[PDB]
């Protein structure tokens, strides 16, 4: 399958979703962060700090503009490199939720083998996995394999890839 | 269904026309907020001018179902659906409706399994003594507004299709057009069964040109 | 069938008759005031017996107070309780 670097749009959506502890679909792309976190002033500047040290440079007054053009303004400079937040969140996802012995290298290898996804798509499927964190502990290899399968399906359906 | 109809321009049809222009043309999303806003106007006009009055009205005061006692409700049913002149229920399905409501009252205010006081709805063919009998066995029902479940049950009985439509609007919601416009043709031929025997409430179909 | 059930630790002891006497009297006193027990009821004599069988100086003063502060003008049932009281206080004094 053709390589494709992760879109700032997907990364932004996954980071916001994960940070609010909400399903990747529940958050609509065309809404300001301020509307999503209306009350909590703490989670406001906490999401802004997370997007700061993810995408380096941030637009002036970013929290009262919808995620539509924020994705575009980041994408302009952003070059599909996971950065720090998403790398640390994926490490935590693997180490805190995997069978044991099944590391991120083995997950990526399993994606590359069975689904034939290169590093660009692997980053994307893993970000989708982060958005749907099993919030427990995958029991056996078979459970983790099935989980990665169901995540690869969702990723493919989001980006528009066939398997 | 949105078909044009020539009617005699009575107060009722004037009301109908007004609502067609101002309420029933509005899109489904803006219908309910407009009804809420205009509730007190809409209820006054129904009660003054139309052949289907606002049901929840006690001594001319515009209540709601939620703010009406079970006795107030039963007396309003007998006042709208039982003809004093002919000393009979206009429709037998209306008598059933009223009995169903009295049995619900006994169900809500009895402490243990008992016999209904209304054993056959034929007893309601003298409605005042039947009311007094039910609200003497259950005098708590004179003082308590309708349970939210009984409001829901009432509104459910008002949409029963194996029944002549109710001669009143019980609620302002998304189905206000159906409550207002359904079964509007019999009243002109049965003025005894209209609020004040007022023709000016009713819909009378008639050609503009044949009216010369 | 022959499984052992007995254990010393599971033995339950009842011996607080001094407390139950006052409860028994009070329950009677209110049952007569509420007209649950009438003057013809044999359970009024059974409860008398039970209160006499537990009589002491704490119970006698408990009865004296509750009976000598019953307002008989409040109803028939109050005159009935006050009459039966005064009798029961005499009985409980004789059987102390």
């Amino acid at each position: 399958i053709a390589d494709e670097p992760v879109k700032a749009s997907l990364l932004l959506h996954v980071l916001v979703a994960h940070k609010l502890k909400k399903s990747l679909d529940s958050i609509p792309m065309s809404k300001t962060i301020k509307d999503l976190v209306g009350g909590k002033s703490t989670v406001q500047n906490e999401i802004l700090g997370d997007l700061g040290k993810e995408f380096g440079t941030t637009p002036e007054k970013p929290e009262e503009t919808p995620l539509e053009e924020l994705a575009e303004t980041f994408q302009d400079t952003f070059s599909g490199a996971l950065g720090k937040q998403s790398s640390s969140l994926l490490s935590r996802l693997i180490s805190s939720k995997m069978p044991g012995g099944f590391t991120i290298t083995v997950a990526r290898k399993y994606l590359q083998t069975r689904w034939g996804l290169p590093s660009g798509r692997q980053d994307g499927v893993l970000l989708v996995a982060l958005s749907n964190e099993p919030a427990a502990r995958l029991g056996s290899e078979a459970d983790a394999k099935a989980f990665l399968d169901s995540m690869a399906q969702k990723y493919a359906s989001i980006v528009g890839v066939d398997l | 269904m949105g078909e044009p109809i020539h009617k005699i321009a009575t107060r009722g049809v004037m009301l109908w026309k007004e609502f067609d222009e101002t309420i029933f043309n509005l899109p489904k999303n803006k219908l309910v907020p407009t009804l809420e806003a205009k509730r007190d106007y809409i209820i006054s006009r129904l009660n003054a001018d139309f052949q289907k009055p606002w049901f929840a009205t006690v001594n001319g005061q515009a209540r709601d179902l939620a703010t009406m006692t079970y006795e107030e409700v039963a007396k309003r049913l007998v006042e709208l659906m039982f003809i004093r002149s002919t000393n009979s229920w206009f429709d037998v399905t209306w008598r059933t409706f009223t009995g169903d409501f009295l049995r619900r009252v006994e169900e809500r205010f009895t402490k243990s399994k008992t016999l209904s006081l209304i054993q056959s709805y034929s007893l309601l063919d003298k409605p005042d003594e039947a009311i007094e009998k039910v609200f003497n066995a259950y005098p708590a029902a004179r003082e308590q507004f309708l349970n939210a479940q009984d409001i829901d049950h009432f509104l459910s009985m008002c949409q029963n299709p194996m029944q002549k439509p109710v001669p009143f609007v019980p609620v302002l919601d998304r189905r206000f057009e159906i409550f207002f416009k359904k079964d509007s043709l019999w009243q002109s031929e049965h003025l005894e069964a209209v609020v004040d025997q007022d023709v000016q409430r009713t819909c009378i179909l008639h050609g503009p040109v044949a009216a010369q | 069938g022959v499984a052992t059930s007995f254990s010393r630790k599971k033995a339950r002891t009842f011996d607080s008759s001094w407390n139950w006497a006052k409860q028994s009297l009070l329950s009677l006193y209110f049952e007569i005031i509420h007209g649950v027990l009438k003057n013809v009821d044999r359970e009024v004599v059974s409860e008398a017996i039970n209160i006499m069988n537990r009589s002491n100086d704490a119970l006698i003063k408990f009865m004296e107070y509750h009976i000598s502060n019953t307002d008989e003008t409040k109803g028939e049932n109050y005159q009935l309780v006050k009459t039966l009281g005064e009798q029961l206080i005499e009985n409980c004094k004789q059987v102390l």
Binding site: - | - | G1, V2, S5, F6, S7, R8, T13, F14, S17, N56
Partner: protein, 97 residues
């Protein structure tokens, strides 16, 4: 009534060890963990119902019932005789109803 006490204990009259333990409990002193009583009466009305069991049906349940209603009533009495004798009690007999 005044000076009465009631002591409710769980007990299987079917069990020999329950019978020994119950009597040995009633007759132990308060320090050792018992009532430090000395029985004046024994009323052994423990029974289990046998209905429909004729001679050819006599089985486990009947043989058990017979241990509750005879054998272990002789063990209760025996135990009460052993305890009274042990404590040299010869003028306070326990009436068996």
């Amino acid at each position: 009534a005044k000076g009465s006490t009631l002591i409710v204990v769980p007990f299987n009259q079917g069990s020999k060890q329950d019978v020994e333990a119950l009597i040995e409990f009633i007759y132990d002193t308060e320090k050792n963990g018992g009532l430090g009583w000395d029985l004046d009466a024994i009323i052994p009305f423990a029974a289990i119902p046998e209905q429909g069991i004729e001679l050819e049906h006599i089985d486990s349940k009947s043989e058990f019932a017979h241990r509750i209603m005879l054998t272990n009533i002789l063990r209760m009495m025996g135990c009460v005789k052993k305890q009274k004798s042990a404590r040299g009690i010869e003028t306070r007999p326990a009436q068996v109803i």
